[PDB]
Ligand binder design. Structure first.
Ligand code: CO0
Ligand code: AKG
Ligand code: FE
Length: 287
């Protein structure tokens, strides 16, 4: 039983329902090849200078990722394609508003480029959010997903070069005795395709077996605005923030947020007014 594949254009309304049911779906042509190209060029040098996840020079080292993984987050200051095209993706927003309507506004918990070196080993099978948001494990098993992860291929995903594994239906598993690589299927994808999973979908990066290919992806974890992002945009220069759309500003934590409660009193407000209203934050101003 393989991962369902859907078109970004023609099957839009079916995407969230497909993930909510099966725990994963592949969105064909999520990002155009041109956006993929520009993102790659813009992040290239930052990927090259990134040290190992647990570098001794970091004061929040990542001890979980392999030493042959490079992860670069806080992409807005680095990439125009990211902060303009990706952050305003119509497809992304429709899926997120489908997924998160019961809770309220959503934002970016982390947008990162990950590059895996040749012969990168497979990751252990896992659920996301367990090294940053312990609170998630205390949710009732049937609580609607509070975050989802778009894993966008920035280069080809093949079985040979370590394409992600997923276990279909595992977002609903409580008993984990059946977890094994034997239960997985692969996310074979062209650049610009995206694998969409929830925070409960059991998955792992695959083993790079060619010894020569360098696989790269854009992981966009989208989550309800009630949960704190893994990454901060507080240090992004104001001129960059004010070049964004109001929607993109909100996604980066440069706006107040709303819950879905009928008489919502809001998140990140200031004496009854919004961040953007208080700071007189401009939008859509070219650099
Ligand atoms: C540690 N880890 C991340 O760093 C990570 C990376 C990219 C996107 C999301 C993300 N959130 C995690 O929970 C995560 C899981 C994980 C577990 C086991 C093995 C390797 C990763
Ligand atoms: O390498 C992959 O394809 C998946 C990466 C992943 O799941 C993670 O780092 O959390
Ligand atoms: Fe993961």
């Amino acid at each position: 039983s393989q991962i369902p594949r859907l078109s970004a254009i023609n099957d839009l309304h079916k995407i969230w329902p497909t993930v909510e049911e099966h725990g994963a779906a592949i969105i064909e042509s999520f990002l155009s090849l041109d956006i993929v190209r520009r993102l790659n060029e813009e992040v290239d040098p930052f990927v090259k200078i990134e040290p190992i996840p647990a570098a001794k020079t970091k004061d929040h080292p990542n001890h979980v990722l392999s030493t042959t993984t490079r992860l670069v987050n806080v992409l807005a200051p680095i990439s125009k394609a990211y902060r303009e095209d990706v952050l305003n993706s119509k497809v992304l927003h429709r899926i997120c508003s489908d997924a998160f309507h019961v809770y309220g506004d959503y934002w970016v918990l982390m947008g990162a480029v990950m590059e895996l070196a040749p012969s990168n080993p497979a990751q252990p099978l896992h659920r996301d959010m367990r090294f940053s948001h312990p609170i998630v494990e205390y949710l009732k098993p049937d609580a609607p997903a509070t975050s989802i992860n778009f894993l966008v291929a920035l280069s080809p995903f093949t079985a040979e070069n370590g394409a992600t594994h997923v276990i279909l239906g595992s977002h609903k598993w409580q008993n984990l005795s059946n977890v094994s690589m034997d239960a997985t299927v692969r996310a074979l994808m062209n650049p610009g395709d995206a694998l969409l999973i929830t925070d409960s979908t059991i998955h792992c990066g695959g083993a790079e077996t060619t010894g020569t290919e360098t696989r790269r992806l854009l992981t966009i974890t989208m989550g309800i605005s009630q949960l704190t992002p893994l990454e901060s945009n507080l240090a992004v220069p104001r001129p960059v923030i004010e070049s964004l759309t109001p929607l993109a500003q909100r996604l980066l934590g440069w706006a107040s947020q709303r819950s879905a409660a009928p008489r919502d009193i809001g998140l990140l407000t200031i004496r009854g007014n919004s961040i953007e209203k208080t700071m007189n934050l401009k939008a859509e101003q070219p650099l």
